[PDB]
């Protein structure tokens, strides 16, 4: 940023430009402004492009600060509304240069330094990448088990396929608490409900999808959406289904389908779904030929299904370094 | 506290309190210890009682400090294990220092200031006064009302007695929450539901009963239990009817027979129960003579009940200064 602040020395804007940096300027907090090296004093206005990235400096210190002190100590002090929180927050202004550049005739120049670091932040965001989180589905089992043996409703190991689904969809429409602050829970079962807290305590820009490892039915990804919503997870990621044994890719498009078929899922969706198709153990337990062509008729089924159910599916491919994953 | 280290000047003491004398001198922290004005110096051996109760002033100006912090601010860093969190964690080293006296002949000197202190200690504990919360049993209702119409399972307001009983009944004997974070509440549910959270926040010591007024049946108090152990209230504090109205006081002893019956109840209670006896309203709208006759009558038929289920009933009279109250 502060290179970027070097290269704005143009003094031609817009009405838009000049009114918000003249807003920075009225707050430009006339002090020594110490801290920074190059450009301690307050900018001034007849270089407004230097006023508003001057601005962006400051927030961008702040969030560097506050993420350095959250990191190493478990808190900070730092104010969140001194830091960049939206994913856009930080465009926002970086957008309003472009406009300004461009409206004033500075399009090349809009076009280099201006345009590289646009499309850092559009691709990067404020953590470089989403992280996706991985999970077998007996695990979400042994937590649901424990949740319906400690509310003495039956055991949810024991239950079919369609007692889980009915059970985990009236949870899920209920507007009522599951579990409490007594649950038992084992090492494995703290575990899991400990990742999905950590995953609710922090920003929900730094998260991408919940895999589930060894997926078979609707009822696990309902599984980790109830229990998302359970630990508070404030903005719900997307659950998407690993199909990695030749088995479950052979039945995949069926298994989604019902998943699709669930009106309450179907309309938290929002007409987006991703599900994952692993080829490593698929080649393993039978032959490589026979699992790459398993995995074709998988990929062209499933496509089907979307848009029989008009949902746009994105496919995720486990592919590995070597031919043979 | 500090008079009383003054005091304790002899040298004679059991094994126990020289044992106990010699550990507080291991951690004696070989400081300046200047925050003090007197005894501002490692308090030596050859005065045993003198670091017994140098220890004591210690943990005395930790809670001081603790409690100061509390009040005026919200927090506090004083360690709470620096402190006395307990009602007789401050006993424990006073009635050593009493055993020791005692052991050694001097027993005139422990039944002096020391002696003095215990009964201050043992009277007023850590909070002078137990605080008693009282409310009314309509504000209860309501509170339930909106948790069982959020929870769309009908309206508790319009449910019969014996109804609210099994029900009440159901979800204290459960382990499932009830209400939750986006529970709709007015001002006046907001209010209740919140003193019972002050309450969980709050040392148990600090408080004394949970009065209901207009208490009629079983299930005003079965709610107000329930509440508590809802709202997450650690050690929930007694709760007690009030009986004002001449109504009230004629059909009171039925009343508390009912309660006594549920077993569920009478089982936690612990065999002691205490219920009010307020005079003011009640020869308001009846006689005095008629008000004062029914109160007597109440008294000795509840102490029937109480008997007859092998509870040990408490009354408190709620007398005014007045004898119209």
Same mark, same amino acid.
């Given at each position: 940023?502060?290179?970027?602040?070097?290269?704005?020395?143009?003094?031609?804007?817009?009405?838009?430009?000049?009114?918000?940096?003249?807003?920075?300027?009225?707050?430009? !907090?006339?002090?020594?402004?110490?801290?920074?090296? $190059?450009? /301690?004093?307050?900018?001034? %206005?007849? $270089?407004?492009?230097?006023?508003?990235?001057?601005?962006?400096?400051?927030?961008?210190?702040? #969030?560097?600060?506050?993420?350095?002190?959250?990191?190493?100590?478990?808190?900070?002090?730092?104010?969140?509304?001194? #830091?960049?929180?939206?994913?856009?927050?930080?465009?926002?202004?970086?957008?309003?240069?472009?406009?300004?550049?461009?409206?004033?005739?500075?399009?090349?120049?809009?076009?280099?330094?201006?345009?590289?670091?646009? !499309?850092? @932040?559009?691709?990067?965001?404020?953590?470089?990448?989403?992280?996706?989180?991985?999970?077998?589905?007996?695990?979400? =089992?042994?937590?649901?088990?424990?949740? %319906? %043996?400690?509310?003495?409703?039956?055991?949810?190991?024991? /239950?079919?396929?369609?007692?889980?689904?009915?059970?985990?969809?009236?949870?899920?429409?209920?507007?009522?608490?599951?579990?409490?602050?007594?649950?038992?829970?084992?090492?494995?079962?703290?575990?899991?409900?400990? %990742?999905?807290?950590?995953?609710?305590?922090?920003?929900?820009?730094?998260?991408?999808?919940?895999?589930?490892?060894?997926? =078979?039915?609707?009822?696990?990804?309902?599984?980790?959406?109830?229990?998302?919503? $359970?630990?508070?997870?404030?903005?719900?990621?997307? @659950?998407?289904?690993?199909?990695? +044994?030749?088995?479950?890719? $052979?039945?995949?498009?069926?298994?989604?389908?019902?998943?699709?078929?669930?009106?309450?899922?179907?309309?938290?969706?929002?007409?987006?779904?991703?599900?994952?198709?692993?080829?490593?153990?698929?080649?393993?337990?039978?032959?490589?030929?026979?699992?790459?062509?398993?995995?074709?008729?998988?990929?062209?089924?499933?496509?089907?299904?979307?848009?029989?159910?008009?949902? +746009?599916?994105?496919?995720?491919?486990?592919?590995?370094? =070597?031919?043979? !994953?």
């Amino acid at each position: 940023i502060e290179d970027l602040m070097f290269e704005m020395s143009m003094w031609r804007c817009n009405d838009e430009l000049r009114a918000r940096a003249d807003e920075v300027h009225a707050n430009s !907090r006339k002090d020594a402004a110490k801290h920074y090296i $190059e450009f /301690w004093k307050s900018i001034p %206005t007849t $270089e407004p492009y230097r006023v508003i990235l001057g601005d962006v400096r400051d927030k961008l210190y702040h #969030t560097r600060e506050r993420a350095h002190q959250l990191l190493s100590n478990g808190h900070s002090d730092v104010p969140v509304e001194a #830091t960049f929180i939206n994913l856009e927050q930080f465009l926002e202004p970086l957008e309003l240069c472009y406009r300004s550049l461009c409206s004033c005739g500075d399009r090349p120049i809009a076009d280099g330094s201006l345009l590289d670091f646009l !499309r850092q @932040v559009s691709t990067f965001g404020l953590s470089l990448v989403r992280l996706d989180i991985r999970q077998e589905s007996d695990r979400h =089992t042994d937590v649901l088990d424990a949740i %319906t %043996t400690h509310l003495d409703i039956g055991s949810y190991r024991e /239950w079919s396929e369609e007692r889980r689904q009915e059970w985990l969809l009236s949870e899920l429409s209920g507007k009522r608490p599951l579990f409490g602050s007594d649950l038992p829970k084992t090492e494995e079962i703290a575990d899991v409900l400990d %990742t999905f807290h950590v995953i609710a305590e922090l920003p929900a820009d730094s998260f991408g999808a919940y895999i589930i490892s060894m997926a =078979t039915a609707p009822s696990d990804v309902l599984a980790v959406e109830l229990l998302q919503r $359970e630990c508070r997870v404030k903005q719900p990621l997307r @659950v998407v289904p690993l199909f990695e +044994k030749l088995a479950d890719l $052979e039945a995949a498009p069926a298994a989604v389908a019902r998943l699709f078929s669930v009106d309450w899922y179907k309309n938290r969706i929002n007409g987006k779904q991703e599900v994952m198709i692993g080829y490593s153990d698929s080649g393993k337990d039978a032959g490589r030929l026979s699992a790459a062509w398993q995995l074709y008729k998988a990929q062209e089924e499933l496509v089907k299904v979307a848009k029989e159910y008009g949902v +746009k599916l994105t496919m995720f491919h486990g592919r590995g370094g =070597t031919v043979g !994953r």
